Amino acid sequence: VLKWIPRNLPSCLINVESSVTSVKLHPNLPIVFVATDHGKLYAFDLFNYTIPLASLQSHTKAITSMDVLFTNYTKNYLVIVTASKDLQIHVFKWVSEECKFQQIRSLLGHEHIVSAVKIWQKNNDVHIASCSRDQTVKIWDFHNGWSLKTFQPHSQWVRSIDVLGDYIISGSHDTTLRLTHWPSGNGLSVGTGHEFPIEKVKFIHFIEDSPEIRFRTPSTDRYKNWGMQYCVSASRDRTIKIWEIPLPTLMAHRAPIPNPTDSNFRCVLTLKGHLSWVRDISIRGQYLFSCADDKSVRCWDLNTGQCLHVWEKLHTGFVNCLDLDVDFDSNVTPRQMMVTGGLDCKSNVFMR
């Protein structure tokens, strides 16, 4: 059920007025969330995509990113976090019966434009992470609405982040990546090897059962306790890179400290083949999906390392983002659909 591959043609095509910037999928219903260059947030039904289920204008400028989350309290509901160039972040509630956006709150405090938001829940506690052009990654509490942490991990402005427990990896415009421990706020490791600003960076989580996977398994019990093996990055030099995360000086029931000899990323793999800036990356099962500004979407294997499938001329303009269902989450069923959104004021969905 993890070996699903989209066919050569999109299952449905969605027309929106302006350039699509971010796309997310509803983890329980066939609903696609599309945020565009006017800041307009759209909710489309997959089987009835002629008109949107909802459409709301909340930002005065272009939305740069999105992330959704279905809450799991020990009521359950969907939280949509949309960040834009108006220096603010907006947090919305999705109402299933009303089929209408109900904005919960807004988060302020970023000096310049904000480029990425990630929302995660650990145990009855939901936090919102964000990175902005004022070079400060900030995390708020979702319930409180006040800022808990801010830290500057880079010299230049950071572009993408990722969350996994209490560790954040961040890529920036200074073509370097950096892993930091969030509670301590200290840069655990730094990494170089890209020659252009980083578009997307996310962790490569673990999976339980498979025939064989090389990038989603621990090599030892120490890595199993660590909880993360490698990471994936994409940048404007038309390359994707899989980096091995080195380990820092770890102590039990204590804040981790960086290792002077083991505080540098190791570039394990370098996947090339995209003709322009690789915008977005996404990993489902054993396959890694990516898009670039070459009007194409490429599906690679983590094991072999070469491009199995190419979807060329998928958009008239650039391709801006993808979204696939999360595979490593027990509570999120990895359903068989992949959605992409491009600069030609359009989105595509591949189903079955």
Partner: protein, 496 residues
């Protein structure tokens, strides 16, 4: 005889044997570049039999360009076998980083390189037309191959921006890519509201070609406000270079310029950061700055920056950086020539010149260290086609066609826009005609004509037409609403 070279005392030259090395003849150049093209075409063995016609075509092109565009026309029309060597290097560089080639593709690529090497310094439109006809005659005489398209400057768009290899890109796709990249550039860098025309795309392509070469320097000559600094910054942003513009104001001397140059060299070597240094003609105030630039350009280093304690700490930093990458270097010569290799690899100097008639810019162009290394690109002033494209892209957003228009019957050569059908074509033609007449009757001479007047007039016309049309429509609506109310009132009075 030439400026820069000073007559020498006979008391010294009487002790040295004087040997005159003339230019090699046609046969010698043909043999040399036959060998060079054989070395190139070892990459493409299926076209190994075309080395002799390519070399003969290159040599004949060099001879014809030397004979036609003499120094009497312009002072910078100096040709040499160095141009043929640069043609060979460009053909090899493009064949190495390209796809599988055909004979038509090879001929078009060689013609593109010949355009970019022998005919970027040409000033007049008639000279460029003569070069285009010369390319047609050379290709017909030496490479009789059919199904070969237009060989003009704008019909040869070879670029590696759109793909992974240096191939010939479509004009529309390249224009769309450049528009999107320039929107992103304006979003992330300084905002300049530019208009993308075909000459802009061609100039972007050649600046990108020159900035991708090892020790690839530039010398952009043209009128003011023609887009030299902004295209240089955009192209260096495309290639990932770091832009350094010397902020040399009037209260500056050799200390500040030397500090800027030393910081740029230190960043290039000790940090391995590629740098594009944009030297303007207004930054070089005195001749000593020009001498420093000549030292930086002819060689790969400025020895006057590092002396004594500065030289010692430079060598210490060089040894530290060499040990950082784990290279076994111990001698001072190894550290120094690695340093100058890194400078020649990671530094690109782009010269911006606005008034070549001026004595300072004449010394700039005529300087031997700059003329023989910097790739001259005479952007010049806008022609009528570029002006028409910019004006059409600027007046297409304003409400202009509202009244009746009768198509004029004017002469064919008096219309620069596509043949007149609407009021917008007439407005564009009127603006171009008045720009030409104004610059003719102010006795500008052979000086370059900045299009700043044209662009400012277009922007002012757009704003004024918008405001006047708003006022006119408001007044017409007011009088029509009032007349309708008056008619309704008089009809109600007549009914009752």
């Amino acid at each position: 005889t030439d400026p820069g070279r000073i007559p020498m005392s006979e008391r010294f030259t009487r002790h040295a044997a004087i040997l005159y090395l003339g230019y090699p003849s046609g046969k010698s150049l043909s043999q040399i570049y036959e060998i060079y093209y054989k070395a190139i075409f070892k990459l493409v063995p299926e076209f190994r039999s075309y080395t002799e016609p390519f070399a003969r075509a290159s040599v004949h092109l060099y001879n014809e360009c030397k004979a036609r565009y003499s120094t009497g026309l312009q002072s910078h029309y100096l040709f040499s076998p160095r141009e043929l060597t640069r043609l060979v290097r460009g053909v090899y560089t493009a064949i190495n980083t390209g796809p599988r080639q055909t004979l038509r593709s090879l001929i078009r690529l060689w013609a593109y390189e010949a355009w970019r090497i022998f005919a970027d310094r040409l000033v007049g439109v008639k000279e460029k037309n003569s070069f285009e006809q010369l390319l047609y005659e050379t290709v017909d005489k030496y490479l009789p191959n059919q199904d070969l398209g237009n060989i003009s400057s704008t019909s040869l768009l070879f670029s590696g921006l759109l793909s992974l290899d240096f191939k010939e890109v479509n004009k529309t796709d390249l224009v769309n890519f450049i528009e999107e990249r320039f929107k992103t550039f304006c979003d992330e860098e300084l905002e300049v509201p530019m208009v993308i025309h075909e000459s802009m795309v061609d100039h972007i392509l050649r600046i990108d070609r020159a900035l991708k070469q090892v020790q690839g320097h530039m010398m952009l000559i043209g009128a003011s406000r023609t887009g030299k600094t902004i295209l240089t910054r955009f192209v260096a942003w495309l290639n990932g270079l770091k832009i350094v513009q010397p902020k040399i104001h009037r209260h500056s001397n050799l200390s500040d310029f030397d500090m800027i140059l030393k910081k740029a060299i230190s960043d290039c070597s000790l940090k391995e950061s590629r740098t594009c240094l944009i030297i303007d003609e207004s930054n070089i105030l005195e001749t000593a700055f020009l001498e420093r630039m000549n030292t930086l350009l002819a060689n790969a280093d400025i020895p006057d920056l590092f002396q004594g304690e500065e030289y010692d700490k430079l060598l210490n930093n060089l040894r530290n950086k060499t040990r950082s990458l784990g290279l076994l270097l111990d001698t001072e010569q190894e550290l120094y020539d690695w340093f100058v290799g890194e400078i020649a690899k990671n530094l690109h100097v782009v010269f911006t010149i606005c008034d070549p008639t001026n004595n300072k810019s004449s010394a700039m162009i005529s300087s031997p260290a700059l003329f023989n290394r910097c790739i001259i690109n005479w952007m010049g002033d806008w022609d009528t086609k570029t002006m028409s494209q910019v004006a059409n892209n600027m007046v297409d957003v304003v409400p202009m066609e509202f009244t009746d228009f009768i198509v004029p019957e004017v002469n064919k050569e008096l219309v620069f826009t596509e043949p007149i059908q609407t009021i917008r074509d007439a407005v564009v033609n009127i603006l171009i005609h008045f720009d030409r007449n104004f610059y003719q009757k102010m006795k500008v001479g052979v000086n370059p004509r900045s299009p700043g007047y044209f662009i400012d007039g277009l922007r002012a016309l757009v704003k004024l037409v918008t405001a006047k049309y708003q006022d006119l429509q408001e007044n017409q609506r007011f009088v029509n609403v009032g007349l309708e109310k008056l008619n309704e009132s008089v009809l109600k009075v007549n009914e009752l």
